[PDB]
Copies of this chain bind each other. A is one copy, B any other.
Amino acid sequence: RRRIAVADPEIKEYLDGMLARIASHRGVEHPFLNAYRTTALDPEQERHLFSECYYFFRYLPFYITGMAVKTRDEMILREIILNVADEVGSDPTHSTLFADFLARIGIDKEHLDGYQPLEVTRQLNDGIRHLYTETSINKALGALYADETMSSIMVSKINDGLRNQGYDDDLRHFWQLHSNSVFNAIAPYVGSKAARAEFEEGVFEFLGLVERYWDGVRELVGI
């Protein structure tokens, strides 16, 4: 079926439209993130932003691995494994690089352990775990497609804000760290309208969590 799907010009057209719908979604093109690109923060504002990011990011590599039990498709497993291998395959791992960045901007492990993140942050982290491990493979692939498309944009915006704050490229290294492979894997799963409905449900449930997350963070840091 994948060998038929990759040959269907309509499937390429559909997934290209979903790329644009994701990138233009308010959860990705968020006012707070665009504001942060040009608005420096004071120490307490910056401490709040990246402490919430820590609880957003925590244990996400383990959540996507829970998708593998729901499929027997090796192209799907390859995409999952490739993403996790990028995060933990070598040293330093991504989470180790993130904790180092936090320490270099005055947010140490001791403060993070005592930090109580927003409920929308807990709902985002738990919501991602639910989408990858407790939903249909088509729905989970929609969330994965949204995650993969968004992540690069989001980190570029935070990289912009940190550069505007005055940090050098070395400090911002964590935020300055396959399209055909991702298209090849997903194509057979967006053929029928029922599969696309599950696919889009996962895309917009994922992005809805991110949007409500950035809404809560925006109020916490303010302006």
Contacts and interface: CB of A to CB of B under 8 A. Distances in A.
Nearest 9 interchain pairs by C-beta:
A65-B68, A66-B69, A74-B88, A78-B88, A81-B84, A81-B85, A77-B88, A62-B68, A65-B65
A187 to B, nearest CB: 17
Contact of A95 (B68, B74, B81, B89): B74
A78 B89 CA distance: 6
A202 interface: no
Interface string A41-71: 0000000000000000001011101101101
A4 to B, nearest CB: 18
Nearest to A75: B88
A165 interface: no
Copies held by the complex: 2
Contacts of A85: 81-82, 85, 89
A205 B66 CA distance: 24
A164 interface: no
A63 B68 CA distance: 8
A72 interface: yes
A40 interface: no
Contacts of A63: 69
Contacts of A71: 62
A81 B69 contact: no
